[PDB]
Amino acid sequence: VCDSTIENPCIVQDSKTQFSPVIRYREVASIADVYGGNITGINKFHLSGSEQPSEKGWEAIAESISRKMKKVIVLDLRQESHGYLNGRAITLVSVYNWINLGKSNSQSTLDQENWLTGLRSRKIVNGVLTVPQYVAKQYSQGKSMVVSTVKNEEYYVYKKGFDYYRIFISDHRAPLDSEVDALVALIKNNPEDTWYHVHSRGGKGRTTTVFAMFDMLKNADKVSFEEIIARQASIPPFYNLMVTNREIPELTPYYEQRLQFLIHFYEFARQSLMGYSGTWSEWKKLNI
Amino acid sequence: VCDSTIENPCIVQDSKTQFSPVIRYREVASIADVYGGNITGINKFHLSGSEQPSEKGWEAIAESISRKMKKVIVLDLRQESHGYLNGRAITLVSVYNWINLGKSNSQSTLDQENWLTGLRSRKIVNGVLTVPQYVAKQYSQGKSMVVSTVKNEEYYVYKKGFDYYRIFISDHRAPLDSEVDALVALIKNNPEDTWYHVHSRGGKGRTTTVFAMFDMLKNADKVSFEEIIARQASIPPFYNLMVTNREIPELTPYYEQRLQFLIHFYEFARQSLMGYSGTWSEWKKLNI
Numbered sequence A, B: 001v002c003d004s005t006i007e008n009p010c011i012v013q014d015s016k017t018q019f020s021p022v023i024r025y026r027e028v029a030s031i032a033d034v035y036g037g038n039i040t041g042i043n044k045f046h047l048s049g050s051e052q053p054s055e056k057g058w059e060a061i062a063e064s065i066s067r068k069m070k071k072v073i074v075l076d077l078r079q080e081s082h083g084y085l086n087g088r089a090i091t092l093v094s095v096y097n098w099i100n101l102g103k104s105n106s107q108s109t110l111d112q113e114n115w116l117t118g119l120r121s122r123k124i125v126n127g128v129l130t131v132p133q134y135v136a137k138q139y140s141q142g143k144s145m146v147v148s149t150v151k152n153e154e155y156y157v158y159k160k161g162f163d164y165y166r167i168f169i170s171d172h173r174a175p176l177d178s179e180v181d182a183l184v185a186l187i188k189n190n191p192e193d194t195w196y197h198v199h200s201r202g203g204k205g206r207t208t209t210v211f212a213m214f215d216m217l218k219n220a221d222k223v224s225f226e227e228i229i230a231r232q233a234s235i236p237p238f239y240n241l242m243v244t245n246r247e248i249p250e251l252t253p254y255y256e257q258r259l260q261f262l263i264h265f266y267e268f269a270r271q272s273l274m275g276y277s278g279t280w281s282e283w284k285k286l287n288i
């Protein structure tokens, strides 16, 4: 039985079933129809987001994107190991969902795939907890499931004809400099009309952080920091990056550091639109 | 001005700039995480591949290999003359990219280095076309570039501490018997843990052909021909050697002949694992 430590992490099922719908899908362009302030530069974005989809959720997302549209990149922002069991999204969870904190991206991927390969070799996976059970620390009350499939996200993304690109952000935290560099380079290295579907585990903090970064890179020279944050918070699930006191109070320092990073990334973005040509890491060494 | 004939071939710049990233890098071992069929014998391969890198792409490849690991051999599969101008990959292109078709390997190398030596002696190289310009036959719209450096691939491979080994395969075609012999001998003449980075011009047909040959030599006695081809097609760029009708229809005969060769190479590989001890050329004389 698991106990939520990194030595005995828990298998947590995120999808209620393999048919569960997407509940935090949204498109950034819709901000232009709801936000009452500066909407300059919004309505052209080719940008959607969600929480981790079930197997069937990937169908709904692919359909939503087809209706609004070119190349599609699914942007997985999750550092932690995750995948699918019988079409249900699953995560390998240690306290605060930081199983891969401090690891190189290569090691994060290796540890996830060694885990999925291990599950895939079993006829029955034991100890599968729901999110309520994990929160309630009912570690021994998990279900035993006959394995039909064990898959990584790539399996479902590739099936839709989309590309997959992973940015290894720790849950509840700001991206590290390597991952900021990676996101800026990804955007620059692909056509302006590329569609990006951004997702995290819950489709809240990491997803909305990256949405704001996209916005800043295009518009920081024409829209104030406050209005970028506020307009990103204007569409469901109304995630406001200004808020640093959330349901889990012990995470406040990471929400504070995340907003502080966004302050600095805004200045980088603004200066980049005014002539600066280096990377985020280079700018940060000189300016922070 | 060039006209794409062998008498007046074109200088075509393959890298957008000297900083352009690698877009078709992949490692064969990753098949074990994506392919839903027989993955026997895959996850141990020390094998990566790509298209022709820019100067900066060689950095990214060297870093990727270091993270996954011993001796490293860069396997250049390109018969045609190619090199670098100011860190951008360049090719000397006649119709279908067959400038060196029918030449001995020694002559191919001599013609390439006489060409690079010629460019290196100039202060300005004229007529440098992009791939779009060449496709559009805009032979006179090429750019004139001040020469900072002119280098062959060896310059960048040696800089990384890697070995360089060339297999002279014509674009869009199967390897000739001498080059099959050379590849089998190279693999046999180096330790099992040798890392190979295989590349062609586009990182598609020739690269994936050689990947499949590596796979067959190790696993043809335990994996069906169909599953070897299918599993090699399971990772980006999803190059499927079974497909014989591609974007350029006039090349279909060469894609057909390439698949036919792979059928025969599979039987050679299988018999070799069951006792046969001769070379490909010897086997082919007796069995085809």
Ligand SMILES: O=P(O)(O)O[C@H]1[C@H](O)[C@@H](OP(=O)(O)O)[C@H](OP(=O)(O)O)[C@@H](OP(=O)(O)O)[C@H]1O
Residues within 6 Å of the ligand: A097, A131, A171, A172, A173, A200, A201, A202, A203, A204, A205, A206, A207, A246, A247, A248, A251
């Ligand atoms: O998917 P579940 O298991 O529900 O967990 C979610 C994810 O961790 C969210 O982050 P992300 O979307 O990046 O994966 C997190 O957002 P933040 O911690 O950044 O706020 C949510 O915290 P709450 O905001 O308290 O709901 C948390 O409930």
Ligand SMILES: O=P(O)(O)O[C@H]1[C@H](O)[C@@H](OP(=O)(O)O)[C@H](OP(=O)(O)O)[C@@H](OP(=O)(O)O)[C@H]1O
Residues within 6 Å of the ligand: B097, B131, B171, B172, B173, B200, B201, B202, B203, B204, B205, B206, B207, B246, B247, B248, B251
């Ligand atoms: O690098 P560029 O200039 O883009 O040209 C590429 C190379 O010729 C590819 O072969 P290789 O990787 O061996 O160099 C070829 O693969 P095949 O002809 O074998 O299929 C591609 O054809 P397409 O598959 O049609 O894209 C072609 O577009």
